[PDB]
Amino acid sequence: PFFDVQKRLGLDLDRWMTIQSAEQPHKIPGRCHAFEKEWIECAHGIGGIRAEKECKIEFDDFVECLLRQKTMKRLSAIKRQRDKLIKEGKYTPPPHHLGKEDPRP
Amino acid sequence: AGRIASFLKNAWAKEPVLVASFAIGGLAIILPSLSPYTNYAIRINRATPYNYPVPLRDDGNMPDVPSHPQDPQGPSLEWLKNL
Amino acid sequence: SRGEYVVAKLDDLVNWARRSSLWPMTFGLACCAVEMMHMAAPRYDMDRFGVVFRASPRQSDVMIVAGTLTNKMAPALRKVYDQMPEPRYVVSMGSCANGGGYYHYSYSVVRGCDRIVPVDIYVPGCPPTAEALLYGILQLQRKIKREKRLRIWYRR
Amino acid sequence: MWFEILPGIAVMAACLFIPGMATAHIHKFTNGGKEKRVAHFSYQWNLMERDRCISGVNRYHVTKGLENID
Amino acid sequence: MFMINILSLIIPILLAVAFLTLVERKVLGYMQLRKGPNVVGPYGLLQPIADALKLFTKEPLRPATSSISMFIIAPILALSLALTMWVPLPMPYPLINMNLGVLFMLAMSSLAVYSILWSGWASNSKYALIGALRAVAQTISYEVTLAIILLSVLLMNGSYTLSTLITTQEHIWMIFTSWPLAMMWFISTLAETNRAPFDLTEGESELVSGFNVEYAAGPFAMFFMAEYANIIMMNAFTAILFLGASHDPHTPELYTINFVLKTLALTITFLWIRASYPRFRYDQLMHLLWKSFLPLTLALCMWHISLPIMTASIPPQS
Amino acid sequence: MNIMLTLLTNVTLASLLVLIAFWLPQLNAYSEKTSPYECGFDPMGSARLPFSMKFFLVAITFLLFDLEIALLLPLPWASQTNNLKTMLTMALFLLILLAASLAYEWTQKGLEWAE
Amino acid sequence: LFQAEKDRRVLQMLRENLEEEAIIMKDVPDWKVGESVFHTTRWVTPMMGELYGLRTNEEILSATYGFIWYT
Amino acid sequence: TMYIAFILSTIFVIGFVGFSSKPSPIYGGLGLIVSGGVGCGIVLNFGGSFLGLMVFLIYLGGMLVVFGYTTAMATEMYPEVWVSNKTVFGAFVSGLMMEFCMVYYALKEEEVEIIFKFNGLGDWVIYDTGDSGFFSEEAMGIAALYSYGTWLVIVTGWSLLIGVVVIMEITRGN
Amino acid sequence: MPLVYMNIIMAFAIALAGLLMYRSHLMSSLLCLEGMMLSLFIMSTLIILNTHFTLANMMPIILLVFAACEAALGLSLLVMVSNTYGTDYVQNLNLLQC
Numbered sequence A: 001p002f003f004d005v006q007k008r009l010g011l012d013l014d015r016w017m018t019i020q021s022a023e024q025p026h027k028i029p030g031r032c033h034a035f036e037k038e039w040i041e042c043a044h045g046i047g048g049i050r051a052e053k054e055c056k057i058e059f060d061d062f063v064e065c066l067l068r069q070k071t072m073k074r075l076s077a078i079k080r081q082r083d084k085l086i087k088e089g090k091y092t093p094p095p096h097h098l099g100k101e102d103p104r105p
Numbered sequence B: 001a002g003r004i005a006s007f008l009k010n011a012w013a014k015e016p017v018l019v020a021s022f023a024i025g026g027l028a029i030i031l032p033s034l035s036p037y038t039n040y041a042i043r044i045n046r047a048t049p050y051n052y053p054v055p056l057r058d059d060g061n062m063p064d065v066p067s068h069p070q071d072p073q074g075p076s077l078e079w080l081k082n083l
Numbered sequence C: 001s002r003g004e005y006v007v008a009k010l011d012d013l014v015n016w017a018r019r020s021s022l023w024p025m026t027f028g029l030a031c032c033a034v035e036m037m038h039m040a041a042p043r044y045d046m047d048r049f050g051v052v053f054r055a056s057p058r059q060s061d062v063m064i065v066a067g068t069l070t071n072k073m074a075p076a077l078r079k080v081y082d083q084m085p086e087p088r089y090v091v092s093m094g095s096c097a098n099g100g101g102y103y104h105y106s107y108s109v110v111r112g113c114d115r116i117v118p119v120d121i122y123v124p125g126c127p128p129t130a131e132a133l134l135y136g137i138l139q140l141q142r143k144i145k146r147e148k149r150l151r152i153w154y155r156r
Numbered sequence D: 001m002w003f004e005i006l007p008g009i010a011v012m013a014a015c016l017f018i019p020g021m022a023t024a025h026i027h028k029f030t031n032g033g034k035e036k037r038v039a040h041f042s043y044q045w046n047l048m049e050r051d052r053c054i055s056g057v058n059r060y061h062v063t064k065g066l067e068n069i070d
Numbered sequence E: 001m002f003m004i005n006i007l008s009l010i011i012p013i014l015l016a017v018a019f020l021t022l023v024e025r026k027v028l029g030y031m032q033l034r035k036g037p038n039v040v041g042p043y044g045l046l047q048p049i050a051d052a053l054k055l056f057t058k059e060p061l062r063p064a065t066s067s068i069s070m071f072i073i074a075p076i077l078a079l080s081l082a083l084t085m086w087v088p089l090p091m092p093y094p095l096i097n098m099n100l101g102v103l104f105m106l107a108m109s110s111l112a113v114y115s116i117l118w119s120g121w122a123s124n125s126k127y128a129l130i131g132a133l134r135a136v137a138q139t140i141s142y143e144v145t146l147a148i149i150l151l152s153v154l155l156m157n158g159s160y161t162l163s164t165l166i167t168t169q170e171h172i173w174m175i176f177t178s179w180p181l182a183m184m185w186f187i188s189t190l191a192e193t194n195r196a197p198f199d200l201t202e203g204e205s206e207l208v209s210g211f212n213v214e215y216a217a218g219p220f221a222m223f224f225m226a227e228y229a230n231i232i233m234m235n236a237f238t239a240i241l242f243l244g245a246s247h248d249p250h251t252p253e254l255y256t257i258n259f260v261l262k263t264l265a266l267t268i269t270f271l272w273i274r275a276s277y278p279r280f281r282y283d284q285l286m287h288l289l290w291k292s293f294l295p296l297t298l299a300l301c302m303w304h305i306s307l308p309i310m311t312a313s314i315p316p317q318s
Numbered sequence F: 001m002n003i004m005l006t007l008l009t010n011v012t013l014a015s016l017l018v019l020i021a022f023w024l025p026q027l028n029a030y031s032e033k034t035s036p037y038e039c040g041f042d043p044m045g046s047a048r049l050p051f052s053m054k055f056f057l058v059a060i061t062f063l064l065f066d067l068e069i070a071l072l073l074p075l076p077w078a079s080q081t082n083n084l085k086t087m088l089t090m091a092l093f094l095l096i097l098l099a100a101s102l103a104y105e106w107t108q109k110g111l112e113w114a115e
Numbered sequence G: 001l002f003q004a005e006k007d008r009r010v011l012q013m014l015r016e017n018l019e020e021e022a023i024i025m026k027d028v029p030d031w032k033v034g035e036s037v038f039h040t041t042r043w044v045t046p047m048m049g050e051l052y053g054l055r056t057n058e059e060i061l062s063a064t065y066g067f068i069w070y071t
Numbered sequence H: 001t002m003y004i005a006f007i008l009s010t011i012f013v014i015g016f017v018g019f020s021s022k023p024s025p026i027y028g029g030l031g032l033i034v035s036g037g038v039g040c041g042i043v044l045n046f047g048g049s050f051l052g053l054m055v056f057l058i059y060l061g062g063m064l065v066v067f068g069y070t071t072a073m074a075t076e077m078y079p080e081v082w083v084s085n086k087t088v089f090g091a092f093v094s095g096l097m098m099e100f101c102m103v104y105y106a107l108k109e110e111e112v113e114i115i116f117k118f119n120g121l122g123d124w125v126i127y128d129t130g131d132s133g134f135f136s137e138e139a140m141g142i143a144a145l146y147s148y149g150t151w152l153v154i155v156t157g158w159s160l161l162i163g164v165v166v167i168m169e170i171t172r173g174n
Numbered sequence I: 001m002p003l004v005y006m007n008i009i010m011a012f013a014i015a016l017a018g019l020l021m022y023r024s025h026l027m028s029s030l031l032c033l034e035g036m037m038l039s040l041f042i043m044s045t046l047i048i049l050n051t052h053f054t055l056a057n058m059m060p061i062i063l064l065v066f067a068a069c070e071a072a073l074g075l076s077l078l079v080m081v082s083n084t085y086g087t088d089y090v091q092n093l094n095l096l097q098c
């Protein structure tokens, strides 16, 4: 099934492209380089079963960085609450959010 | 060499476009391995600073790592300036 | 009147372009077609007048029926004339296209292309010289100048 | 003779002058008398955004310097 | 102001197209011992106006068997892409400064290929169908050859930006650097623009106006305008790519004058070639590029890959 | 934004020209005016019948060579790498394989149109 | 210098968004202001909406498409 | 926001609905060209200009051959258009209505499909704040096909050469 | 997950359903087959660009290469079928029975 010719011969045919924490041209970092590095270092050398059981925190952080589901949920909840508040006039946005400020350079 | 010369003469009279194409391709394959400027091109590409040169923490045993850009230690592009 | 003045100037503008941008269909029969070629030749250059041959009847404004029209050819001439879009003009050249020509009393000749298509200009000769056909083209241009379509519409 | 072809070529050349000259004039007019800033990369775009922010008039071409620091 | 810039790019281009029609008429006339248009106005200067007014006041017709939806779209697409090809050209400042200023040209040309195909197929006529398939074959050939030639020439440049082309050609000319690729590119531009000796899609002698046989009045004038705009645009592209003019940032008018002069010279060369040469046969055109241009083009591409590396003259990325 | 604006401008101008062409001039259309053109005679068959394509193989080879040019396009940026030897070797490998494909097709007569 | 300015601007925008969130979500039954999403306490770059979320459409559009649309 | 990428995605799905309803190969190629152009626009907005222009050029070249092949081998007396045939129009309307239901439900509420979970928020919010400098990350990654990716170049070149040999062998006949 | 991915996956699903439901022409099914890989290309590049997977930008090009290799294979089979039967109809591919 999986004849590991690359590891037997010391070659490198696709392991460079396997992950986004590997050597990238001009040292361009991935979006979730730190999270992937943490998950990989947690899961290295313990097997798939133990990696799934014990590195679940790292994997969940990696998935959150990748997809941004909980972050988008929080942003949507904040947007809905703000829209409800401004519908009844309870909330008045500040000038620095309305565009009447001088931002930082 | 007579047979080769006859073949080249016939091809030049029949297919000058193909003769020129094969000659140009052969030159393009052979010449780069002999030119001394290939290493110069490699060094010029290596000397281009696309990203920031992150400094190194000085532990007191780095004699060849400069403390200032203008110090004598470090890479020099004097070879590139006159080229 | 303002309206009559506007329509008169507009009609002059429209008639000027059609007058000075004649695109005859590339269509010749028999001997009379050679005089069209000599008209297109450098000596009597038709292109300098705005007269340019085009192959497709759709992109043609004038049909020069130059040569003998036979019974076997009349349906095709009528078909190309119909497929030529309006405004369209017809110049018959030579005795064969005008009337019967040398072959008037022939079983297989149409005694006049005006039995098939409405003819605007008749050029007499056998064959008419390139100068004669150029005169016919200029006469057709002058005939175009006198058209008052917008003036007819306004007073309609 | 052959020089009667020139007026048509002259008119065509004059017509072809208009796009480039008009574009240059509009670039100078809408960028404060200077060349339109070319931002082919995120660094140059960030430079333009910082120029907008520091100007205080929301125009990047309005440049400030030593008289602005002090 | 950007809308004013767009109009300033558009309207003079159409004026130049009409007066290019006039110039081609007169140039062919004087090369054929005639005079060309000299009656309508002073030296025939009103002839394009007369022709345009006649075409747009004449009746257009839709064939009974035609597919009307694609019958109308084809001139729209042709004219729209002919006008769109002019937005990234620097004279010396492009209207739209695209980072990849050449791939856009290639993509829009490949899209403008389909205008003649859809016009021919929608016409539901045999000559239109034959013209459409001739367009298919011609597009195949010139597409592959243009792609490789352009890749090599821009490989000498460093990027796909035309202002970068100007900066590269500041000192000398790409015609001096790579004249064989220049000649093959000129032939490829002729084939792309469907000019003689490659006017196969609209070959008057063999087909009755080819793909636009059923097009009359305004829609035909749109095809003519698109063709001439493409001619001028491709000559301008060739001038920028191979004949680099000097640029002075403070007085950019000199670059515009030089660019327009070079473009006019190349367009007059186009008309000169049309007057001089007979017409190809589309299978002979296909065998001309694939069997003659393509091998030499591959060889020159290898040579122009190896040359900057072996001479330590790789252009800057930015 | 600007590219969308100029595309809209060009398309709008073309559509306005079509509208002017199809609504300004006088229209008088009948059955014979709009009939298909076959040089004056009625067409024998239909233009929608199959039309033989003698260069069918060359079209497929064009597809493959379009892939080849797609692969070869990013070369100008690939010349800025430090691994110039590897980049040059692989670029020449691709070009030599393309040349070999062309030579094989030519020698096996794939470029000759069907009779 | 640009790195320092970027850090200060990002932190300032984050603090302004946090204060506005505290003002807005003051009656929500179960809601912690400024609560992190990730388990780790390591610094995480705000994606695009944590900075330009409660701001004008002009600023949002400039931040998210200004470079690409600039020609 | 301006929902530009979302509108382009909707147009992409509409073109797919068309050429999947499959009136005739001519209109299928037209719909595929439209879809390719709109996808080029989508990926241009997302960041990949080279990839967008590349896919647009590739599909423009590919549909050119398909036009020649449908004129030669896939044409009939009366080619079918979307309103020509009951089945084609039914499939087209079904696809349009399914897309409309999906977009409307997703806009009104965070639609959790039976397959995946999609959140109704900004494609602009999903972007990243960080940026590169003086090089295009997409361009460098694509150009890395020669420095890196030596294996990919070899397998791709061999696949193309074998494809030429294969198309020679299949159409040999006899 | 944003709605752009939803639309791209929906496009792939529509293209897949179009392939699995033939009408008459083998060419139309080939067009549906080409649409599936177009959707795959768009989805893959949208995922890669968003996550800044720099070395993954070469994957879509290989995807396109093998897509058009499959297209070439399908066109060759279609021309052989057309030469055999006179039309590219899939109803004529019934000599073999399951």
Ligand SMILES: CCCCCCCCCCCCCCCCCC(=O)OC[C@H](COP(=O)([O-])OCC[N+](C)(C)C)OC(=O)CCCCCCCCCCCCCCCCC
Pocket (backbone or CB within 6 Å): D039, D040, D041, E073, E077, E097, E098, E099, E100, E101, E104, F001, F002, F003, F004, G067, G068, G069, G070, G071, H004, H007, H008, H011, H030, H033, H034, H037, H038, H040, H041, H042, H044, H045, H049
């Ligand atoms: C809501 C709009 C719907 C429009 C529908 C119709 C068009 C569909 C295509 C998408 C919209 C147009 C392109 C938008 C680009 C947005 C991003 C942008 O501005 O990028 C700047 C970039 C700038 O270039 P760059 O990307 O190299 O540079 C990056 C930016 N700087 C300069 C700062 C480094 O623009 C381009 O690259 C231009 C690409 C144009 C591509 C056009 C593709 C579509 C062509 C027509 C398709 C349909 C064919 C139909 C055929 C006939 C059918 C009947």
Ligand SMILES: CCCCCCCCCCCCCCCCCC(=O)OC[C@H](COP(=O)([O-])OCC[N+](C)(C)C)OC(=O)CCCCCCCCCCCCCCCCC
Pocket (backbone or CB within 6 Å): C006, C009, C010, C013, C014, C149, C150, C152, C153, C156, E049, E052, E053, E056, E057, F020, F024, F025, F026
């Ligand atoms: C270089 C330019 C390129 C693009 C050019 C685009 C076209 C530009 C055309 C401009 C001139 C148009 C003149 C009207 C053409 C009418 C055509 C036609 O069919 O006419 C016959 C028809 C004849 O109608 P009828 O009533 O006889 O119809 C019955 C016909 N039978 C019997 C056969 C059934 O005339 C009309 O319908 C009347 C048209 C009136 C004018 C319409 C508006 C024109 C506006 C032009 C600009 C005005 C500017 C202001 C005034 C300036 C004064 C100095």
Ligand SMILES: CCCCCCCCCCCCCCCCCC(=O)OC[C@H](COP(=O)([O-])OCC[N+](C)(C)C)OC(=O)CCCCCCCCCCCCCCCCC
Pocket (backbone or CB within 6 Å): F019, F020, F023, F024, F025, F026, F027
């Ligand atoms: C600015 C937007 C323009 C949109 C397109 C409009 C057409 C004109 C396009 C530009 C070119 C103009 C060239 C010069 C003028 C010629 C064209 C022109 O104006 O034609 C007008 C047409 C001309 O009719 P025509 O068929 O004789 O056009 C040929 C014109 N000549 C003679 C010059 C060649 O006239 C009308 O439309 C008059 C009636 C107007 C009201 C009815 C309109 C149609 C029905 C719509 C409603 C249907 C439901 C009714 C109930 C509603 C309430 C429930």
Ligand SMILES: CCCCCCCCCCCCCCCCC[C@@H](O)O[C@H](CO[C@H](O)CCCCCCCCCCCCCCC)COP(=O)(O)OCC[N+](C)(C)C
Pocket (backbone or CB within 6 Å): C009, C010, C012, C013, C016, C019, E039, E040, E041, E046, E049, E053
């Ligand atoms: C964009 C919309 C369309 C634009 C249309 C307007 C732009 C063009 C303006 C008109 C173009 C010029 C028209 C005038 C041509 C003058 C040329 C001159 O030679 O013509 C003379 C006079 O011209 C015509 O006779 C008069 C009609 C043309 C002018 C019409 C009046 C102006 C109309 C409105 C113009 C402005 C348009 C405003 C509304 C759009 C007589 O010529 P003719 O006798 O034959 O030739 C005989 C042969 N010869 C020379 C050897 C002896």
Ligand SMILES: CCCCCCCCCCCCCCCCC[C@@H](O)O[C@H](CO[C@H](O)CCCCCCCCCCCCCCC)COP(=O)(O)OCC[N+](C)(C)C
Pocket (backbone or CB within 6 Å): A011, A012, A013, A016, F083, F086, F089, F093, H147, H148, H150, H151, H154, H158
């Ligand atoms: C019959 C069934 C079996 C057939 C098997 C055929 C196998 C085809 C031959 C290919 C075998 C592998 C060749 C080498 C593949 C790449 C190996 C690469 O990793 O080596 C690099 C050395 O590269 C090579 O020296 C370049 C030239 C390799 C030869 C290319 C031309 C010859 C190709 C022959 C193919 C023939 C067609 C197939 C025939 C069936 C150095 O290692 P690396 O750790 O990464 O370096 C780091 C570089 N970084 C930093 C950028 C990542």
Ligand SMILES: CCCCCCCC/C=C/CCCCCCCC(=O)OC[C@H](COP(=O)(O)OCCN)OC(=O)CCCCCCC/C=C/CCCCCCCC
Pocket (backbone or CB within 6 Å): B014, B015, B017, B020, B024, B027, E175, E180, E181, E182, E183, E184, E186, E187, E197, E238, E242, E273, E277, E288, E292, E293, E296, E303
């Ligand atoms: C950019 C502006 C320059 C424009 C150049 C315009 C040139 C003048 C205008 C000429 C009119 C063009 C219209 C004619 C179109 C047809 C052209 C044509 O037929 O040429 C193709 C003709 C082949 O046709 P046949 O002979 O019939 O078939 C051969 C059968 N065995 O010849 C060609 O293929 C041209 C390709 C070769 C030209 C390139 C010259 C090669 C010389 C190589 C030396 C240089 C080597 C490079 C560097 C090497 C290392 C130092």
Ligand SMILES: CCCCCCCC/C=C/CCCCCCCC(=O)OC[C@H](COP(=O)(O)OCCN)OC(=O)CCCCCCC/C=C/CCCCCCCC
Pocket (backbone or CB within 6 Å): B029, B030, F096, F097, F099, F100, F101, F103, F104, F107, H161, H165
């Ligand atoms: C090289 C790719 C193939 C690798 C091995 C695969 C073998 C199995 C697959 C076969 C497909 C390969 C087909 C290509 C070669 C077959 C073509 C052929 O048979 O003929 C070759 C053809 C025959 O011409 P004639 O006989 O004169 O025509 C007479 C007409 N009346 O001549 C040729 O050789 C043309 C080939 C040109 C390109 C060949 C590519 C190989 C060249 C390799 C050189 C570079 C090596 C690198 C070394 C670097 C040293 C520093």
Ligand SMILES: CCCCCCCC/C=C\CCCCCCCC(=O)OC[C@H](COP(=O)(O)OCCN)OC(=O)CCCCCCC/C=C/CCCCCCCC
Pocket (backbone or CB within 6 Å): B008, B011, B014, B015, B018, B019, B021, B022, B023, B025, B026, B027, B029, E294, E295, E296, E298, E299, F096, F099, F100, F102, F103, F104, F106, F107
């Ligand atoms: C280097 C300094 C010294 C300079 C001198 C060196 C020059 C000599 C170099 C080698 C010369 C090569 C000569 C081979 C060409 C002659 C082959 C030949 O004649 O083939 C005959 C025959 C004639 O064509 P017909 O179809 O019969 O015409 C129709 C007749 N009614 O041609 C063929 O069959 C095609 C042969 C395969 C074509 C190959 C073209 C593709 C390869 C060229 C691309 C660029 C070169 C590739 C890399 C080259 C280096 C590996």
Ligand code: SF4
Pocket (backbone or CB within 6 Å): C029, C030, C031, C032, C066, C067, C068, C093, C094, C095, C096, C097, C101, C102, C125, C126, C127, C128
């Ligand atoms: S009129 Fe005289 S010249 Fe003309 S076609 Fe008749 S016989 Fe010939």
